[PDB]
Amino acid sequence: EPVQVFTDDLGRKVTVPAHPKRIVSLHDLDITIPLIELGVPPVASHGRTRPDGSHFIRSGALLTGVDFDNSSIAFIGTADIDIEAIVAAKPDLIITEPTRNTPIERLEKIAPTVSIDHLKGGAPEIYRKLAELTGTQSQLAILERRYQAQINALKATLDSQKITVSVIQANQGKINVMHSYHSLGRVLRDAGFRFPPLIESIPEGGRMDVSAERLPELDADFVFATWRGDTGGKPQDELATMEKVMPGWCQFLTACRSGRYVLISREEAISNSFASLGLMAAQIQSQIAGRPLP
Amino acid sequence: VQVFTDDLGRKVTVPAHPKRIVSLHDLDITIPLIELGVPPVASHGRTRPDGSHFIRSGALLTGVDFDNSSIAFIGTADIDIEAIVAAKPDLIITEPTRNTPIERLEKIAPTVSIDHLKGGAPEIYRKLAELTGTQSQLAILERRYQAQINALKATLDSQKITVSVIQANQGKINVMHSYHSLGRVLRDAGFRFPPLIESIPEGGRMDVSAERLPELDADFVFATWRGDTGGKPQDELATMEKVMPGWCQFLTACRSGRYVLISREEAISNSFASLGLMAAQIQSQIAGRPLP
Ligand SMILES: [Cl-]
Ligand SMILES: [Mg+2]
Numbered sequence: 001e002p003v004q005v006f007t008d009d010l011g012r013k014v015t016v017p018a019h020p021k022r023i024v025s026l027h028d029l030d031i032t033i034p035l036i037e038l039g040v041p042p043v044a045s046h047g048r049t050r051p052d053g054s055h056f057i058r059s060g061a062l063l064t065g066v067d068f069d070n071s072s073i074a075f076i077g078t079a080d081i082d083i084e085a086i087v088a089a090k091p092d093l094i095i096t097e098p099t100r101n102t103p104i105e106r107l108e109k110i111a112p113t114v115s116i117d118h119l120k121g122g123a124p125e126i127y128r129k130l131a132e133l134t135g136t137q138s139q140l141a142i143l144e145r146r147y148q149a150q151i152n153a154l155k156a157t158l159d160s161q162k163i164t165v166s167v168i169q170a171n172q173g174k175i176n177v178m179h180s181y182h183s184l185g186r187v188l189r190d191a192g193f194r195f196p197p198l199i200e201s202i203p204e205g206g207r208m209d210v211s212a213e214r215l216p217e218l219d220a221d222f223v224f225a226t227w228r229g230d231t232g233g234k235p236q237d238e239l240a241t242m243e244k245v246m247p248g249w250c251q252f253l254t255a256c257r258s259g260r261y262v263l264i265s266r267e268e269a270i271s272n273s274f275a276s277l278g279l280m281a282a283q284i285q286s287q288i289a290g291r292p293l294p
Numbered sequence: 295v296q297v298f299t300d301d302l303g304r305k306v307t308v309p310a311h312p313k314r315i316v317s318l319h320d321l322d323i324t325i326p327l328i329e330l331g332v333p334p335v336a337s338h339g340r341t342r343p344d345g346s347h348f349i350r351s352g353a354l355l356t357g358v359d360f361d362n363s364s365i366a367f368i369g370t371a372d373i374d375i376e377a378i379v380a381a382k383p384d385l386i387i388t389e390p391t392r393n394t395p396i397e398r399l400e401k402i403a404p405t406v407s408i409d410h411l412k413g414g415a416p417e418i419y420r421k422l423a424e425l426t427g428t429q430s431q432l433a434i435l436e437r438r439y440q441a442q443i444n445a446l447k448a449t450l451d452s453q454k455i456t457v458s459v460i461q462a463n464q465g466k467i468n469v470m471h472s473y474h475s476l477g478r479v480l481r482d483a484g485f486r487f488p489p490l491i492e493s494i495p496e497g498g499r500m501d502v503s504a505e506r507l508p509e510l511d512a513d514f515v516f517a518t519w520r521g522d523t524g525g526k527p528q529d530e531l532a533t534m535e536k537v538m539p540g541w542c543q544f545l546t547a548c549r550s551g552r553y554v555l556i557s558r559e560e561a562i563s564n565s566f567a568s569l570g571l572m573a574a575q576i577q578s579q580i581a582g583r584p585l586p
Contacts, residue, residue: 065438146357
């Protein structure tokens with residue numbers, strides 16, 4: 001079996017298959033979804049657990065169509081990982097990350113184990129690392145080409161470099177803003193939309209809370225926000241929460257007053273996935289260029 | 295059982311697991327094959343006046359085109375038989391709008407004809423999955439679509455909201471029983487449509503007089519704009535104004551800022567990719583755009 005040395009984010013030099021056939025993933029969102037997108041789904045995965053004891057891969061069905069109930073992917077735990085289940089899956093590669101609590105020393109006894117950290121370079125680096133680790137560089141190239149096509153289509157729709165945007169979130173009586181809000185921020189920046197200085201000046205990978213009084217500093221041509229829908233929530237929830245931040249908040253933003261405040265489903269907006277990038281690009285396109293107002 | 299009856303009624307013996315498929319149509323066959331995980335070794339595509347070739351919607355919807363793959367281009371109008379032979383296919387898939395005599399293809403490899411006019415996209419994918427042994431991948435694609443519809447249904451009471459899809463067609467308005475991807479998602483999500491649309495037979499369409507715009511009004515009115523040739527949404531608005539000056543005032547949806555323009559290339563696709571794009575846009579356009 002052909003083999004490679006991979007340097008993980010703990011600086012460990014790990015001899016791994018050139019083409020792993022049985023991967024165990026210790027995080028649904030951070031690892032399993034990217035693996036599925038790369039065409040190398042794990043044989044076992046971390047996931048979430050509901051109070052009735054049912055299990056699911058977070059965003060699995062929604063973004064990839066893959067979940068525990070329609071696949072041969074074994075569930076290995078949510079909090080404490082079932083070591084017996086990992087062993088039973090007979091992995092040739094185990095992928096974990098720094099926020100997991102299963103000891104590396106235990107995992108490495110089972111199979112070549114690597115730890116990957118999204119704090120080093122974000123989603124693009126995670127996919128680059130996973131593609132190298134799994135020999136799926138050709139599939140990554142296809143994913144990247146489609147993303148290029150999506151950005152180019154968006155850029156061709158409108159003069160993005162002359163349109164300002166912002167992404168905001170209610171946070172316990174204040175406004176939280178990121179330099180780049182996950183998938184949504186990534187697409188906006190890649191398409192060349194410009195952000196207000198308060199947001200642009202936040203260090204890369206950073207974020208800040210902003211006082212309600214300063215809302216006008218977050219104003220732009222279009223203002224985006226997200227709402228949580230994975231547990232029965234609705235867009236009106238973020239509206240109600242913004243009201244708790246400041247009654248009449250709408251009047252502090254020319255974007256909201258003019259009907260250019262846009263609410264996006266959070267679960268897809270926060271994912272690292274190529275699926276998410278496409279969903280963002282489409283929504284940005286029609287919300288900005290495809291919604292004429294009287 | 296390696297036996298596939300095609301849409302011409304031909305009983306064709308095929309490979310159990312075809313490895314080298316030749317596709318005679320980019321949109322109707324190549325895109326679905328790529329989505330099913332069995333991209334062809336050669337494909338029909340389009341040709342620009344400078345001689346460059348592309349798989350229509352290939353890069354945009356799948357990330358796959360001639361210029362970043364080993365897929366051979368085999369022609370736009372006339373099919374290059376020599377190129378097909380050189381591709382060493384084990385299966386050739388064609389469709390009834392093509393002009394290549396089936397007998398020429400049959401001499402090369404097992405050849406099957408699939409017709410999107412019988413059942414549309416759902417039937418195309420079912421047939422291609424059976425033909426290529428990709429029933430498992432199709433189930434995955436179908437599961438994602440179900441999740442997307444359920445997400446949309448959970449966002450709002452779609453059964454209380456009416457929607458309408460319209461298209462400018464040479465001075466009149468064309469409406470379909472179901473506008474490809476866009477219409478499929480709207481119907482599947484449980485939205486209601488204007489009385490006129492429900493009267494159109496399945497797979498059918500009709501032109502209506504510009505004067506009858508009010509009968510096509512709904513809570514939200516959707517239309518599409520062509521962008522694959524440098525077009526922009528404003529170009530579609532210009533077209534409507536020529537159909538009917540002040541057309542906006544004849545629709546309560548347009549007057550009140552509930553007229554939505556969607557990119558046509560994605561909207562008319564048979565793809566699962568497009569269904570997801572439609573669902574996301576419907577969701578935020580209807581439920582995520584509060585107006586003053
Ligand atoms: Cl141990
Ligand atoms: Mg400003």
